[PDB]
Design a binder for this molecule. Sequence first.
Ligand SMILES: CN(C)CCCn1cc(C2=C(c3c[nH]c4ccccc34)C(=O)NC2=O)c2ccccc21
Length: 278
Amino acid sequence: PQPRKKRPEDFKFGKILGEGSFSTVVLARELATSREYAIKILEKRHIIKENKVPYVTRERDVMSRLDHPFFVKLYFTFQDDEKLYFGLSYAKNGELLKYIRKIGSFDETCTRFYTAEIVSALEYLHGKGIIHRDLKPENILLNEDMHIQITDFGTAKVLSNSFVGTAQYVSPELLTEKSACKSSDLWALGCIIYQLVAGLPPFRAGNEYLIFQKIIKLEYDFPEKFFPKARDLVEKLLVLDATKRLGCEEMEGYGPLKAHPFFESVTWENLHQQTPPK
Ligand SMILES: CN(C)CCCn1cc(C2=C(c3c[nH]c4ccccc34)C(=O)NC2=O)c2ccccc21
């Protein structure tokens, strides 16, 4: 016996946090409780016309399965005659990409802390047989406590090859076999760790085709003063042979990955309870 289904009038919608091709996320305050939520609004007709029902269904069905501090929580859903509403946690501190730009380049203490939270959050995701398929700093929010909260699960996939995330994070197997697996998220991770230290992602070029070209030839390099243990880590994630990436079952999973020297001082059992380095 769950709470009465909620409805638009139960809210006071405010500013639009963002707009996508198929949806709009708007900050709303629930009148009855003063709770502030990020409500994602999708227009049924548009979804139907562009054949996205499988995607909206999936996004909903994945988020309902997640119950972990490093993921945006789906509190509720409801719909009217024209739209679909998803009540989501409202991460007050924006996205990780904003910070990367804002401060430019993370030092080692922050690079290590944030990477760890991400590794820790994927281990959970991948433990449930789910792959994100579009991991990036824009999709890794920061709550008011500055801990991470990953979102954007519409493109996710539950295990038992129709999508491609953002070009600069696309794995090479995705560009040759047309099929993503856990490996693709580990590749993205490697890219992100590189981006935290260097200030920018590893593969960059004038258009997408040129980016894809670099990815499959593994064409990138590290700056001169890139933390050595971080570099080593990235070199073990950005590996063309998917089955040889730290974290993959073929490489014996997250045990080895979390054991990397780069994470020597990390206490994995409760990152959520530690204080993020300011
Ligand atoms: C990449 N952009 C457009 C924003 C970051 C990605 N993103 C944030 C969010 C979320 C939040 C956002 C938090 N700030 C935002 C600004 C623009 C759009 C969304 C948000 C939020 O508080 N909770 C979210 O789930 C989100 C939800 C579904 C799909 C992608 C989402």
